[PDB]
Design an enzyme around this catalytic site. Structure first.
Site, short mmCIF file in Angstrom:
data_model
loop_
_atom_site.label_atom_id
_atom_site.label_comp_id
_atom_site.label_asym_id
_atom_site.label_seq_id
_atom_site.Cartn_x
_atom_site.Cartn_y
_atom_site.Cartn_z
N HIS A 61 32.96 34.49 35.05
CA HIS A 61 32.84 34.02 36.43
C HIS A 61 31.39 34.04 36.84
O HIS A 61 30.80 35.10 36.93
CB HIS A 61 33.74 34.89 37.32
CG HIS A 61 33.75 34.38 38.75
ND1 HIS A 61 34.30 33.16 39.10
CD2 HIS A 61 33.30 34.94 39.90
CE1 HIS A 61 34.17 33.03 40.41
NE2 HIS A 61 33.55 34.10 40.95
N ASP A 63 28.94 33.05 39.76
CA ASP A 63 28.73 32.67 41.13
C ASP A 63 27.41 31.95 41.32
O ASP A 63 26.37 32.56 40.96
CB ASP A 63 28.76 33.92 42.00
CG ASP A 63 30.13 34.51 42.11
OD1 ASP A 63 31.07 33.77 42.50
OD2 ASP A 63 30.35 35.69 41.74
N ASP A 175 38.57 33.03 42.32
CA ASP A 175 37.87 33.87 43.30
C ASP A 175 37.88 33.41 44.74
O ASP A 175 37.58 34.30 45.56
CB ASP A 175 36.43 34.16 42.85
CG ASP A 175 35.86 35.49 43.34
OD1 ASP A 175 36.57 36.43 43.68
OD2 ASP A 175 34.58 35.56 43.33
N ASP A 312 33.06 38.90 35.90
CA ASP A 312 31.84 38.32 36.46
C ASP A 312 30.71 38.39 35.47
O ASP A 312 30.37 39.44 34.91
CB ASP A 312 31.45 39.07 37.73
CG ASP A 312 32.39 38.81 38.91
OD1 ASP A 312 33.42 38.12 38.71
OD2 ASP A 312 32.08 39.24 40.05
N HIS A 442 32.13 29.64 47.22
CA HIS A 442 32.81 30.68 47.98
C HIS A 442 31.99 31.92 48.31
O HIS A 442 32.54 32.85 48.89
CB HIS A 442 34.13 31.06 47.24
CG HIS A 442 33.92 31.57 45.87
ND1 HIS A 442 33.88 30.75 44.74
CD2 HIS A 442 33.65 32.84 45.41
CE1 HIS A 442 33.62 31.51 43.68
NE2 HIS A 442 33.49 32.80 44.04
O1 LIG Z 1 32.24 37.30 46.81
C1 LIG Z 1 32.36 37.81 45.47
C2 LIG Z 1 33.84 37.91 45.14
C3 LIG Z 1 34.66 38.89 45.96
O2 LIG Z 1 36.02 38.77 45.52
C4 LIG Z 1 34.26 40.37 45.81
C5 LIG Z 1 34.29 40.86 44.37
C6 LIG Z 1 33.32 40.12 43.45
S1 LIG Z 1 33.74 38.36 43.39
C7 LIG Z 1 32.18 37.52 43.05
C8 LIG Z 1 31.70 36.97 44.40
O3 LIG Z 1 32.07 35.58 44.49
ZN LIG Z 2 32.97 34.37 42.90
#
Ligand SMILES: O[C@H]1[C@@H]2[C@@H](O)CCC[S@+]2C[C@H]1O
Ligand SMILES: [Zn+2]
Ligand SMILES: *[C@@H]1O[C@H](CO)[C@@H](O)[C@H](O)[C@H]1NC(C)=O
Length: 1016
Positions: A61, A63, A175, A312, A442
């Site tokens: 993942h 971001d 996510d 992530d 997001h």
């Molecule tokens: O905003 C974050 C997500 C959110 O679910 C909190 C945990 C990490 S994920 C990676 C980001 O997009």
């Molecule tokens: Zn994310």
């Protein structure tokens, strides 16, 4: 013919509003599956003739900004993930990997040497590296406008088609913080066959799991027939991380994340580490893992199981690739060779999983349920509902909508012509599209990134706005200058944009004054653009350096105008009051511009030595005790003063609005005979808990219902004009304005929460409307969904995204609030509407962001308020899950999202100026929009191609005959049409060659895309 989207209630197996009414939402301890139950399976379910097929799908993942910027993550993490994926997939032919975020992939690929580009293309072509979704980002689904979801999807998929020769048909959304049916709507119209989602309320996961309804055919809430349905997989557990994807027991699953044994700085919170697989432990380790798999499989209807393997920014280091791959290979060799497990397990991709699911379905092994509804508001645990991010960082939420419109306008204005490469049109548009697309992430529009990352998104969006302005103004100059005179310098500013609402009066003084004078310049041309495909008249305003200005069209016909002062509000720290000051050197002139469909209209502003015949002047009344004088330079009417008092105003034949002594609406009278209907605005504040969990960027955890803002004795300014009147009041943290032009009022709030820590400011409307527990909110600006307030859920669970509007109604009366920005809102009691304005939070909410929200800045929020009688309207039945706008509410929404654009000619004389463009364009029915007009080819293409996205909404029938309009055939908007094709919404696949080169209009609630081809 068209499906009826009002009168027939679809029959679905799962309707999410109905499910919500029936569910109890108890948060009990389910054991190792904390939000579930102890899953049991019959071992004899699988055997030699009926094996469990397991696809382990490696993923990472990434971001595009969150706790680092896009470029920071690219340099520190993502470039290494992608480089090492290329190497390890090349070298290990059975290994697989999926990739979602094309912004990063494009950043990577263009920095590759040709040898590596070719190697990359080969692992994509052979199916080892598979793109999922293929959007620029994995967008937010709550705050995003559907037009921008489509924009970003198209940006990524067009890249993939061009450089990778692939178009994904499976979507991966692991996510976003809750999920919207706008996604399957767009995806199904873009060639998709399958989608996956993850972040749904834990109670919904439990309920659907118990019924094996986690895979479903997701159709739109109005869709009787099912043609919108898209197969959807909902993952069942708390996260997409490896502990929550192998099976129900994270203490066991964590042992199969081979990055957690210590050297990588990771460990298992359940205190049992992974162990390297060896021949001495593989039988035991396999029995643990297969049992987890078989429990997960119990939740689904086929013998095909999806096991994501990632987290992530995973799969960075070469040692990480090896430790995951080698250990899983040892497990697969053992498991697959030991007949007693009756399992065949392998690395796979997402599409491989779905193909195998549907092969099972076609063999008769499963039938899937149908579902309609949405998956808001998400809670991941206990009472932690993620309704905060519907409002967090509202400045940038507003900026999103401004940029949305300017991208549309720039693409449309420049599409009419082919441009030489030296004009840099394609270059600027690509930059604008990509920055707006990036912000749909997001962690972008959601307001959930770190402060410096928000600054990066804002800077990118500002460059995108400048790019749009450049393209727009070049295009206007070309469209409105005699061709044999036109002599462009593609770096020059022929026009500047004037925007009255962004950043806004009180946010940035960015507007240019038109400077006129006898000894400098007598007159100025201005030009309005109308992106909508119908004629529009709308008041427009400009700043001018004299009050003695008159307006003409380019046939020199006088145009009625109103001049008003330029008022700015100041927080007077020496008197401790908020009060307005008027300019003594610039004035506002307002007049009605009439602009063709998708067209342009030119007007002239001329100075005179005295009041002109066709210009009137507003009166101004300042209500406050202890006033002082308010000089206005040459403005011809002196300001009046009075003590605070109730007042009433009416512009034209429009509604009469009554206001409290504090400057806030109290009632609306639609017509002269009719009742004064109570409609009261109020500002309130929510706080934060002093024990337990704290609100932050994601979470809204109020410490009870909101408390009224103490208003004191605020200063109220009344401006009364023939064309436009307003009431403005300086309240704590909000300069609140109600503006009347003869129809539905406009509300503007200049919101500056200042240093009020741990405060959320809400704007509430209180009415008499007997709405009970029902209210309606939109999804992505596309559709309105019925909401039911549930007192069995906490306050923050009853908050929903308000991306473009909300309403309440009873049998006779409706109140609709349209917005120019996505914000959170609700109806917490019968007759109420409320929408959050800003939130300032000192603490972090324990989701990984590592900060609260303390970077607030002044924002100008805009709204329209529509009170209507609806007893004569043909509405859906009480069981229908949708609602629909009236004509007036839809037009008011369009007024906010796609206003006329205003251009000021920059030089003293425009030689060869023309008065209008597009007077011959068809003026389409009011429910139809040309959402996108985009030229798809550069100038060297012998066959030019222009794409159009057409959207028809559904407006209620209320007895306004409202008729005679012209058919719009987008394929004939440009000359020399040689072909017209219906395409996917991304323009990337031809679906139908159209007879006569005529593009039909679309049905209510449908969206279609067409491409016209031109030979000259
Ligand atoms: O905003 C974050 C997500 C959110 O679910 C909190 C945990 C990490 S994920 C990676 C980001 O997009
Ligand atoms: Zn994310
Ligand atoms: C793309 O793929 C198709 C079939 O997958 C193939 O015929 C074609 O050669 C490829 N075209 C390109 C590389 O643009």
């Amino acid at each position: 013919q068209c499906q009826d989207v009002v009168q027939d209630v679809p029959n679905v197996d799962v309707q999410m509003l109905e499910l919500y009414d029936r569910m109890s939402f108890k948060d009990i301890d389910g054991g190792v599956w904390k939000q579930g139950w102890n899953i049991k399976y019959d071992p004899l379910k699988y055997n030699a003739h009926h094996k469990l097929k397991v696809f382990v799908v490696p993923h990472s993942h990434n971001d595009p900004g969150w706790i680092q910027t896009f470029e920071e993550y690219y340099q520190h993490d993502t470039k290494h993930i992608l480089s090492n994926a290329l190497r390890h997939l090349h070298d290990n032919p059975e290994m697989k990997f999926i990739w979602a975020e094309i912004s990063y992939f494009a950043r990577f690929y263009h920095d590759l040497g040709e040898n590596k580009k070719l190697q990359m293309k080969s692992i994509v072509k052979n199916g080892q590296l598979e793109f999922v979704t293929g959007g620029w980002v994995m967008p937010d689904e709550a705050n995003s406008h559907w037009r921008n979801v489509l924009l970003q999807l198209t940006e990524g998929q067009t890249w993939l088609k061009q450089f990778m020769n692939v178009t994904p048909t499976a979507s991966w959304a692991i996510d976003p913080f809750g999920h919207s049916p706008t996604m399957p709507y767009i995806l199904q119209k873009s060639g998709f066959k399958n989608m996956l989602i993850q972040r749904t309320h834990y109670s919904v996961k439990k309920e659907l799991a118990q019924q094996r309804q986690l895979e479903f055919l997701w159709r739109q809430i109005w869709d009787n027939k099912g043609d919108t349905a898209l197969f959807t997989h909902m993952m069942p557990f708390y996260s997409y991380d490896i502990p929550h994807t192998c099976g129900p027991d994270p203490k066991v699953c964590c042992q199969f994340d081979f990055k957690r044994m210590g050297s990588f700085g990771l460990s298992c919170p359940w205190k049992v580490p992974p162990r390297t697989i060896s021949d001495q432990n593989v039988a035991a380790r396999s029995d643990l893992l297969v049992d987890q798999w078989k429990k997960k499989a119990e939740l689904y209807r086929t013998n095909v199981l999806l096991i994501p393997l990632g987290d992530d920014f995973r799969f960075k280091q070469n040692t990480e690739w090896d430790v995951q791959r080698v250990n899983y290979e040892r497990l697969f060799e053992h498991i697959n060779s030991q007949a007693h497990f009756n399992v065949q397990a392998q690395f796979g991709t997402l599409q491989e999983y779905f193909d195998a699911v549907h092969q099972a379905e076609r063999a008769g092994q499963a039938e899937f349920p149908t579902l309609s509804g949405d998956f808001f508001t998400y809670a991941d645990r206990s009472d932690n509902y993620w309704s905060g991010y519907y409002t967090s960082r509202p400045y940038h939420k507003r900026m999103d909508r401004v940029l949305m419109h300017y991208v549309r306008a720039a693409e449309m204005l420049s599409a009419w012509h082919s441009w030489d490469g030296m004009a840099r049109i394609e270059e600027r548009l690509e930059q604008a599209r990509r920055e707006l697309s990036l912000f749909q992430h997001h962690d972008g529009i959601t307001g959930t990134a770190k402060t410096h990352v928000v600054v990066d998104y804002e800077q990118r969006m500002q460059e995108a706005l400048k790019a749009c302005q450049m393209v727009m103004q070049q295009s206007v100059y070309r469209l409105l200058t005699k061709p044999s005179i036109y002599s462009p310098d593609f770096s020059f500013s022929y026009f500047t944009l004037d925007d009255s609402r962004w950043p806004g009066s009180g946010v940035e003084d960015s507007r240019t004054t038109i400077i006129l004078g006898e000894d400098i310049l007598p007159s100025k041309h201005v030009v309005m653009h109308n992106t909508l495909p119908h004629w529009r008249e709308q008041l427009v305003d400009f700043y001018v350096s004299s009050p003695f200005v008159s307006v003409t069209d380019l046939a020199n016909n006088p145009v009625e105008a109103q001049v008003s002062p330029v008022w700015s509000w100041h927080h007077d720290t020496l008197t401790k009051t908020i009060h307005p000051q008027g300019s003594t050197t610039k004035y506002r002139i307002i007049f009605k511009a009439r602009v063709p469909p998708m067209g342009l209209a030119t007007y002239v502003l001329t100075i005179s030595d005295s009041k002109p015949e066709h210009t009137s002047y507003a009166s101004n009344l300042l209500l406050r005790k202890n006033p002082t004088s308010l000089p206005l330079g040459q403005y011809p009417e002196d300001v009046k003063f009075g003590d605070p008092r109730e007042i009433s105003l009416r512009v034209g034949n429009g509604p009469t609005l009554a206001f409290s002594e504090q400057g806030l609406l109290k009632s609306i009278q639609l017509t002269q005979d009719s009742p004064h209907v109570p409609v009261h605005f109020k500002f309130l504040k929510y706080g934060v808990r002093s024990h337990g969990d704290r609100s932050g960027a994601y979470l809204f955890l109020p410490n009870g219902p909101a408390s009224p803002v103490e208003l004191g004795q605020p200063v109220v300014l009344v401006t009364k004009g023939k064309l436009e009147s307003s009431v403005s009041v300086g309240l704590p943290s909000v300069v609140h304005q109600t503006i009347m032009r003869g129809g539905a009022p406009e509300i503007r709030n200049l919101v500056d929460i200042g240093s009020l820590d741990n405060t959320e400011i809400v704007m509430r409307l209180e009415t008499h409307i007997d709405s009970g527990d029902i209210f309606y909110t939109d999804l992505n600006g596309l559709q309105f969904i019925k909401r039911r307030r549930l007192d069995k859920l906490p306050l923050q669970a009853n908050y929903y995204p308000i991306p473009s509007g909300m309403f309440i109604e009873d049998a006779n009366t409706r109140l609709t609030l349209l917005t120019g920005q996505p914000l959170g809102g609700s109806s917490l009691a019968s007759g109420e509407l409320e929408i959050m304005q800003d939130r300032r939070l000192a603490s972090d909410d324990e989701r990984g962001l590592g900060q609260g929200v303390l970077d607030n800045k002044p924002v100008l929020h805009i709204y329209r308020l529509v009170l209507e009688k609806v007893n004569n309207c043909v509405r859906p039945s009480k069981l229908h899950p949708a609602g629909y706008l009236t004509s007036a509410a839809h037009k008011a929404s369009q007024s906010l999202l796609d206003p006329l654009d205003k251009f000021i000619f920059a030089e003293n004389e425009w030689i060869g100026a023309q008065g209008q463009f597009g007077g011959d364009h068809p003026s389409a029915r009011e429910d139809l929009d040309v959402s996108v007009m985009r030229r798809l080819t550069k100038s060297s293409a012998k066959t030019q191609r222009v794409g159009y996205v057409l959207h028809r909404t559904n407006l209620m029938q209320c007895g306004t005959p409202e008729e005679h309009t012209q058919k719009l055939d987008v394929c004939h908007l440009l000359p020399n049409v040689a072909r017209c094709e219906r395409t996917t919404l991304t323009f990337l696949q031809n679906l139908e060659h159209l007879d006569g080169m005529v593009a039909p209009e679309v049905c209510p609630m449908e969206t279609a895309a067409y491409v016209s081809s031109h030979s000259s």
